[PDB]
């Protein structure tokens, strides 16, 4: 209570008129502190992009397409996700498991910091990020009072105290664009949250800003590679002699981050300068190893905001989440590789006094080589161990809390002998042969997921221009990343013919760190395609440009169909034949603008 008390005291004082202890609060593993009356945020479903929907009529039926728009962010949805996923306790790992993890984490941070030194991130760096991604964040960073509030909170952090770094589980709250932009104490709430984000970015942002998890720095990492490079990396891993390629999914990774993992992640502060270490130690102790969280809850008499806390799990919407998840997953997979190799036994995991020297010997002689066999991005991993003993090496993985999703905990993992079947970052990758004989390695995922996502707009209250510009952003992302899917190349051509040529793509198609957003432009898509797949592609030795889309390949028809294509169906042939009519209908509603025919 001495670490979280001031944050709760300030909340309690600000909402003194309705603050109460609700005896029928549902929290079982989070400490519950109190509630106050609040207006309900979120919406029961996502708004549909009318431009994309009109140009993808055969997918109006398709069940996965309908499900993608059913995300519920109201208090009911906030509580549903909370109860089904976040309100659990991860059993403490055994003493031998804790020892191996500690040894591996120390070796791993030392390896990651061999060339780079941690540093503080700055006000202008944060401001520049906000401005390049643009707006309430831009208004906040241009207000001197926002930075003065940041300074006061930093002075508390230097004293080992925290007053306003409270995270929340509400995500995007507005039901219509600008709903809270001019509301009562919205500015103060936003300044405190964005200020907390700034302080975290100041102390831990170096991990992302200085590419600590780049493949060159981390061996296993893929930070800064891009979706268009991930397949090539899996193809390169497939050439390393060894067993099958394993890609186990953890059930709710962020909820399985234990107090032991947090204490191993904190070890990076040992490489910092005294002034940086003091600020990063405040972030770790005050907001990672202790956290104060707001979440809404429906009650018989309306909505309340509950104030809860806990000492483990990975927080809601944090700067260091991706990098720290990548670190801990690299460590966990090295531990699993040691178990597969016979370095760690079941008796060792139970033993606090296990032989530290055999772990150090394996890390010092094989560690880097074993990191090179992996592609790790947050909770996503691909591992090609030295043989298949790894498939049944589950003692440490389960004991560290990283229980695999939807599989009995002692059933052996299933690995893949074809890198093209390996799931990684919600995709799988194909090697395609171009008409000229050159090979491409492309990203792919179930087509219903791509169409379903593209049919969701920024939200209610956005103009037809902003909606059409987001539709154009999805169409152009398809032209650059998923051109090999017949239906997507056709729909992309339809959308780009329906939206005025000089309207610039707005919003974002995804928040994924692997998206480099090369499609966020009004440049010719074939020119951008050549830049990404030919000119800048390090795995393309022959730089001969492709002069027509007729020479940009597709997946084989059978694979396109296995992966969701409607090619071959009557409704799809009817759609393809009558698409100029739907394009014209969109153009008529947009108005007298300059359009280009891409069909
Ligand atoms: C200048 C005043 C700005 C008042 N404000 C803040 C805010 C919103 C709702 C509430 C709120 C209302 C009622 C009851 C309780 C609370 C409350 N209680 N505690 N925390 N929330 C309070 C603060 C606001 O208008 N926003 C907030 C940010 N939003 C975003 O969509 C978005 C994508 C964004 C990114 C970049 C640049 C700009 C925006 C973003 C989402 C989530 C996390 C980060 C960034 C909109 C939203 O989430 O509604 C609009
Ligand atoms: Zn704070
Ligand atoms: Zn595919």
Automatic annotation (TrEMBL):
Binding site for Zn(2+) 1: 153, 157, 162, 165
Recorded superkingdom: Viruses
Domain (RdRp catalytic): residue spans on this chain: 243-393
Subcellular location: Host endoplasmic reticulum membrane; Host mitochondrion; Host nucleus; Secreted
Biological role: Component of the viral RNA replication complex that functions in virion assembly and antagonizes the host immune response. Regulates the ATPase activity of the NS3 helicase activity. NS4A allows NS3 helicase to conserve energy during unwinding. Plays a role in the inhibition of the host innate immune response. Interacts with host MAVS and thereby prevents the interaction between RIGI and MAVS. In turn, IFN-beta production is impaired. Interacts with host AUP1 which mediates induction of lipophagy in host cells and facilitates production of virus progeny particles.
Assembly and binders: Forms heterodimers with envelope protein E in the endoplasmic reticulum and Golgi. Homodimer; in the endoplasmic reticulum and Golgi. Interacts with protein prM. Interacts with non-structural protein 1.
The protein's name in its UniProt record: Genome polyprotein
Organism of this sequence: Dengue virus type 3
